[PDB]
Design a protein around this nucleic acid. Sequence first.
RNA 1: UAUGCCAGCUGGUGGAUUGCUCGGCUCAGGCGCUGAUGAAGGACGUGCCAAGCUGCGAUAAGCCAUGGGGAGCC
RNA 2: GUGGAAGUCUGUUAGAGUUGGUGUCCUACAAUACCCUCUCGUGAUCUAUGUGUAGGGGUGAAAGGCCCAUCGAGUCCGGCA
RNA 3: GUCGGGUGAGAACCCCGACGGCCUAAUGGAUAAGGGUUCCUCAGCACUGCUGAUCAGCUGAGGGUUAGCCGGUCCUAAGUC
RNA 4: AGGGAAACGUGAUUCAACCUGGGGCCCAUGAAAAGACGAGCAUAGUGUCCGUACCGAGAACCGACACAGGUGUCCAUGGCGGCGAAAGCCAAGGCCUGUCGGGAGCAACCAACGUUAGGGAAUUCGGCAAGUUAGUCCCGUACCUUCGGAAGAAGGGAUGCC
RNA 5: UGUCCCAACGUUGGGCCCGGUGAACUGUACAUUCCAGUGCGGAGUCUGGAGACACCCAGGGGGAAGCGAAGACCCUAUGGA
Lengths: 56, 81, 82, 143, 46
Amino acid sequence: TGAGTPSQGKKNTTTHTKCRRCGEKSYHTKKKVCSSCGFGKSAKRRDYEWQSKAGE
Amino acid sequence: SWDVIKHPHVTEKAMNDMDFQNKLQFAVDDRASKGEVADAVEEQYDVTVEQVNTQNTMDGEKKAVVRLSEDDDAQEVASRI
Amino acid sequence: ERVVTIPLRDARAEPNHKRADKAMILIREHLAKHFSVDEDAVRLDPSINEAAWARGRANTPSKIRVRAARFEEEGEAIVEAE
Amino acid sequence: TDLSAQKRLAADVLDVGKNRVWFNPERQGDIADAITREDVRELVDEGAIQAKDKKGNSRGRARERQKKRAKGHQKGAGSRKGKAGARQNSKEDWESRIRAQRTKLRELRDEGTLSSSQYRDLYDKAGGGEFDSVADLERYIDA
Amino acid sequence: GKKSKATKKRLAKLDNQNSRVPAWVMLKTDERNHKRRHWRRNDTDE
RNA sequence: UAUGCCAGCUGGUGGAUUGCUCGGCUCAGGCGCUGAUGAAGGACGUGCCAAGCUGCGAUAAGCCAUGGGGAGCC
RNA sequence: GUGGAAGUCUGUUAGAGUUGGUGUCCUACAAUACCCUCUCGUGAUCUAUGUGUAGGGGUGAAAGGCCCAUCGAGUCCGGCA
RNA sequence: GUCGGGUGAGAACCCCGACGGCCUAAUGGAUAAGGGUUCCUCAGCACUGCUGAUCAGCUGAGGGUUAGCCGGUCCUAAGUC
RNA sequence: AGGGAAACGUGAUUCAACCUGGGGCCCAUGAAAAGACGAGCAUAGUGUCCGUACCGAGAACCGACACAGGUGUCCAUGGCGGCGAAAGCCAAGGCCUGUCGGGAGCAACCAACGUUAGGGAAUUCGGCAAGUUAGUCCCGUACCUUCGGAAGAAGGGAUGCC
RNA sequence: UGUCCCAACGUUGGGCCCGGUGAACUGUACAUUCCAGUGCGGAGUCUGGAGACACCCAGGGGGAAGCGAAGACCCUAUGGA
Ligand SMILES: *C(=O)[C@H](Cc1ccccc1)NC(=O)CCCCCN
Ligand SMILES: [Cl-]
Ligand SMILES: [Cl-]
Ligand SMILES: [Mg+2]
Ligand SMILES: [Mg+2]
Ligand SMILES: [Mg+2]
Ligand SMILES: [Mg+2]
Ligand SMILES: [Mg+2]
Ligand SMILES: [Mg+2]
Ligand SMILES: [Mg+2]
Ligand SMILES: [Mg+2]
Ligand SMILES: [Mg+2]
Ligand SMILES: [Mg+2]
Ligand SMILES: [Mg+2]
Ligand SMILES: [Mg+2]
Ligand SMILES: [Mg+2]
Ligand SMILES: [Mg+2]
Ligand SMILES: [Mg+2]
Ligand SMILES: [Mg+2]
Ligand SMILES: [Mg+2]
Ligand SMILES: [Mg+2]
Ligand SMILES: [Mg+2]
Ligand SMILES: [Mg+2]
Ligand code: NA
Ligand code: NA
Ligand code: NA
Ligand code: NA
Ligand code: NA
Ligand code: NA
Ligand code: NA
Ligand code: NA
Ligand code: NA
Ligand code: NA
Ligand code: NA
Ligand code: NA
């Protein structure tokens, strides 16, 4: 079975959804954790220094 | 504080229910229960509410089909507004 | 008006599963020529259609007797089975 | 005119498949104006709208065949397709035969013709598959 | 699928944002809805 | 002299160029914390008609007071 | 004779698999498709949903196979001009 | 598919009738996920539709989903926080 | 009561659903909890909240597309046929939207395919491709064998209708 | 038994003509070539001859060392894994 087009057919599972905390469609309803703001994992907001160029 | 009744839901279907079944249709606050809708309606129009059916609409609001008692006449209660 | 015998041998030149359609066209082109009228003006009564489709789309008869009449202000022919 | 909507309403009002509803070709204009279910029923009463009859397969030829076969014909080697055990289930057939034989022996015992010992003897032999049929059993009984 | 009350409110809003800029607004501004979303060609969130 | 080559003319296509700047970039002076009295952020609402943006919060492009301002405004 | 066992047989039952045609396609219907042929089809079977295992780590009846068209070390951004 | 006919400025493909066909574990009926208004009505054809279109899943505006006894809700599973 | 234009049947067989038993298997042992029963009857009041449209696919889902791909469940009891949930044909129901048409006996060439005399694998790396055989019953069945099998071995005969 | 001797005729969909829709690959320039020669030793374009009126339709692909891909072989780098 091709890993391409034919394997795209079974994709009717919902995972990422609109987050209650940040509003981004990044709340993983299976994990109950937002990949965008960290809701469900961290009280503090998810943020990293690598989201921008080192000197900026 | 929010009010229960927003305004009368007047459409063709709403008319048929009023002319043929003695029911008034309203757009109410979606936090309102059938009970709260029943009361509010009575206190505002001085009528006897017999039954209330609700529906959360694709317009984002709640719609209530309020049936009055044979003692009251929907057509008339609606005609004064 | 007159009674004419239309030969449908030329419908065999068209792929077999589609004779009926072709036949129906031959009939129209035949009346148009023999009655000096435009193919646009030839009207075929459903009788003819049913006659030609009698045995399905692939089994058309080799001939068909057709009664046609000519007249009016733009010239035309109305035809039917016989 | 476009009467497809009415077709859907007529089908439901008449309670029939859309493909069976008929609209009088001479009344498209009137049916076209039919907007409500009531408008439809009305046209129905005027016979402008009707339901064609559903066919059912004729079983005539089936019955003639059923007769020949019940009489014992049209079942020669050239007409069989399934394996023998397929045409008649051997376990099922044994239940048929052995029950008949046991019922037979059961009657002859109450009837008095057989002593509970002869019966027992015959019964065991039947379950042992000693008798091809009831007839064969009766025959054996008469020594 | 089964939608919740909140989900429904959001779908409702999206449908509403899907209307056109009213005719009068054209006259009032002396002269496009960039948020037009087709149910088939586009995909909503959640 | 068809098909056609080269250059130009009239019209087009295209959006370069020149002119223009409600935006940027950089430097400098001043200033500098907010939050359980629930912030920052987000959601959904809110207009006569209202889709976007802004504002605002069921008192919803707003309510009150004082000062300024002024014959206009929404 | 009865009984009805079996990683048993036949089988396009459903379903699973993918041998040959090195056919059709190969700016495709399709970034793995179509047709015929072929294998399995009561079992170490097939399948939906839920759930667990995470990157020098998983998972692997082991082909360096698979871990979202990405694998002899996934993807994203950063280190980084 | 064909012959007639309807509507329309315009009709091979929008609608009516007949004739002729296609689908039978599906091309029928009910649904899960998933989609999200695509449902119905009216008005339209600049866009979309492998041609055309008076048609439409398209464009615009309205309307439409009613529960003590169908689901959720409650319980606990692998397991998760 | 309802429904039907009307009649508004009676018996039978085979019997999905549903109910209830018996047997066999395991180096495999085939959830749990809430709840219900146990534990009567009248009358009355209460029963809020969320979902409910539509598609469910060769155009409403995933695959950038109205994509010949992919995508779970129930209808497995419609008729003939036959071993059959098989073929073929046909109902109910759906459809003419696996959506561009018109014309030329319609050439060459190409895709799928039918039939080819005599020869019969000479073709080719190779019988690749195609073909042959075929269902059912009766007869009959070698070497070998782990005694199970080999085996539908092979081979021979039959087969309709009335 | 059309795999072959050795091919023929036929069926259906294309192909061909017409209406409508309407891309892509590729393009330093010039370009009607052929035979020889020459040249970095594999030339439509240089040299000598020969041939050559222009445009168009269909074809099967000899050539453009045809299009497609900064050779995956081989070596080299004080490259990587
Ligand atoms: C030897 O002759 C190699 C073998 C090889 C190399 C790489 C991969 C698989 C096999 N063959 C070649 O080098 C052929 C080269 C083709 C060049 C064409 N222009
Ligand atoms: Cl439900
Ligand atoms: Cl028993
Ligand atoms: Mg992969
Ligand atoms: Mg409700
Ligand atoms: Mg047996
Ligand atoms: Mg709308
Ligand atoms: Mg087996
Ligand atoms: Mg098998
Ligand atoms: Mg799983
Ligand atoms: Mg290896
Ligand atoms: Mg519609
Ligand atoms: Mg319309
Ligand atoms: Mg429904
Ligand atoms: Mg389509
Ligand atoms: Mg021969
Ligand atoms: Mg040889
Ligand atoms: Mg040879
Ligand atoms: Mg072969
Ligand atoms: Mg020269
Ligand atoms: Mg290189
Ligand atoms: Mg190497
Ligand atoms: Mg190394
Ligand atoms: Na409202
Ligand atoms: Na969508
Ligand atoms: Na400051
Ligand atoms: Na606005
Ligand atoms: Na035995
Ligand atoms: Na295959
Ligand atoms: Na890694
Ligand atoms: Na980097
Ligand atoms: Na049957
Ligand atoms: Na069409
Ligand atoms: Na042949
Ligand atoms: Na060539």
